């Protein structure tokens, strides 16, 4: 199976440098070129550059001066680096592979790395329960994931086992400049005495991992 | 660079219907166009290559046509899972460039929200902030009003909303409204109410609690 797995999301200060690692498997970097594409609110999808099988590189014109792509064939790693970051460089960065060695029809994508370009400092969130209260046999419950920077946090339930009826809402920016996010799930009210419910929260930029058990309040 | 123009920006259809996305190029690009799907929280997925060529693992209901400057991606019978954005890419001319995309939305029957309200936790109150949360669950269409009242005082400017994208299976939306106040203010009041207005309700539905039960 062909896969591309990228390093985690990060905060970078203005004028500072960016570094992402793409690690591939199911093919060899000696046979395929790896492309870089970013996606931003302002500019949408932009192709940035490519490192070919033999090690040559092409950079999209506005990036020639502040972009370098490198790799280690034996380690199956591609190294993306961009200098002189400004605010509009905040985007999701992807690595990608084409169908054939020389082409640009991107059939395989990395999961994407969100890079936030900002002067602020990293902050890990607090996790608070949204406790079920005493809906025709259905109870709702959740977690409030509050006051973190930058994006993203991942949230899951019962270590990935519970997915049905889960809604994890988009994060919103509070006036404080810190993000906040809620995640809910509906379950049978009669399973509240039997099953445990835990939201698993991860804020990689601050290395904060929290498991919050959510229970009906006393 | 080649400018790719995608129209319209939003498409709204009912399941089973046929649907077409347009990609127009600023000059001839032969058949050098690829189409991508981006679902909620996903990476782009390659649907069609070189205008009309199929991709392994892609449902047969996806097809493309066109050449020169006018291109079309078609879904013959739309499914709810097709809810996503669709992008075109040209590669006749370096550098490869992408269109701005077209959003595909699905219609469905009206569905009233289920409404739940959650008091702040004792845990959060320790920090000196109180978050009151109102959940509107699995409803359609997206339009909804959430009005907050504290001891009959209409709240304004102190809440924030967030809405899920359409559910891939039942096409509904869900919404959270969070009312945020100081611990001080929270402790100075009793009745916390969330009033929900929506097309699927004959009357607004209010959920409320008294601080401290």
């Amino acid at each position: 199976q062909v896969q591309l797995k990228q390093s985690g999301p990060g905060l970078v200060q203005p004028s500072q440098s960016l570094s992402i690692t793409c690690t591939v498997s199911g093919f060899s970097l000696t046979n395929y070129g790896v492309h870089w594409v970013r996606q931003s609110p302002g500019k949408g999808l932009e192709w940035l550059g490519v490192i070919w099988s033999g090690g040559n590189t092409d950079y999209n014109t506005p990036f020639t001066s502040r972009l370098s792509i490198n790799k280690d064939n034996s380690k199956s790693q591609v190294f993306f680096k961009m200098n002189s970051l400004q605010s509009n460089d905040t985007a999701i960065y992807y690595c990608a592979r084409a169908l054939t060695y020389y082409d640009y029809e991107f059939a395989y994508w990395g999961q994407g790395t969100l890079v936030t370009v900002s002067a602020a400092s990293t902050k890990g969130p607090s996790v608070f329960p949204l406790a079920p209260s005493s809906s025709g046999g259905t109870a709702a419950l959740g977690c409030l994931v509050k006051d973190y920077f930058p994006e993203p946090v991942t949230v899951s339930w019962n270590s990935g086992a519970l997915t049905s009826g889960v809604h994890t809402f988009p994060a919103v920016l509070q006036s404080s400049g810190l993000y906040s996010l809620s995640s809910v799930v509906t379950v049978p009210s009669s399973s509240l005495g039997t099953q445990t419910y835990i939201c698993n929260v991860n804020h990689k930029p601050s290395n904060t991992k929290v498991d919050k058990r959510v229970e009906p309040k006393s | 660079d080649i400018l790719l123009t995608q129209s319209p920006v939003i498409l709204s259809v009912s399941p089973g219907e046929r649907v077409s996305f347009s990609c127009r190029a600023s000059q001839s690009i032969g058949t050098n166009i690829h189409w991508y799907q981006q679902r909620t929280n996903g990476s782009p997925r390659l649907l069609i290559k070189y205008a009309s060529e199929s991709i392994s693992g892609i449902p047969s209901r996806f097809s493309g046509s066109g050449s020169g400057t006018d291109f079309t991606l078609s879904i013959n019978s739309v499914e709810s899972e097709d809810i996503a954005d669709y992008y075109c890419q040209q590669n006749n001319n370096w550098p490869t460039t992408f269109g701005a995309g077209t959003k595909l939305e699905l219609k469905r029957t009206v569905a009233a929200p289920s409404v739940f309200i959650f008091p702040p936790s004792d845990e959060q109150l320790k920090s000196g902030t109180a978050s009151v949360v109102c959940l509107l669950n699995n409803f359609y269409p997206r339009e909804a009003k959430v009005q907050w009242k504290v001891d009959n005082a209409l709240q304004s400017g102190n809440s924030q909303e967030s809405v899920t994208e359409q559910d891939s299976k039942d096409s509904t939306y869900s919404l959270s409204s969070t009312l945020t106040l100081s611990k001080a203010d929270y402790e100075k009041h009793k009745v916390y109410a969330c009033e929900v207005t929506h097309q699927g309700l004959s009357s607004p539905v209010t959920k409320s609690f008294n601080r401290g039960a």
Partner: peptide, 12 residues
């Protein structure tokens, strides 16, 4: 329309 990180979807 604009790409939104939160959902990785276009917001109009």
């Amino acid at each position: 329309c604009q790409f939104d990180f939160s959902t990785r979807r276009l917001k109009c």
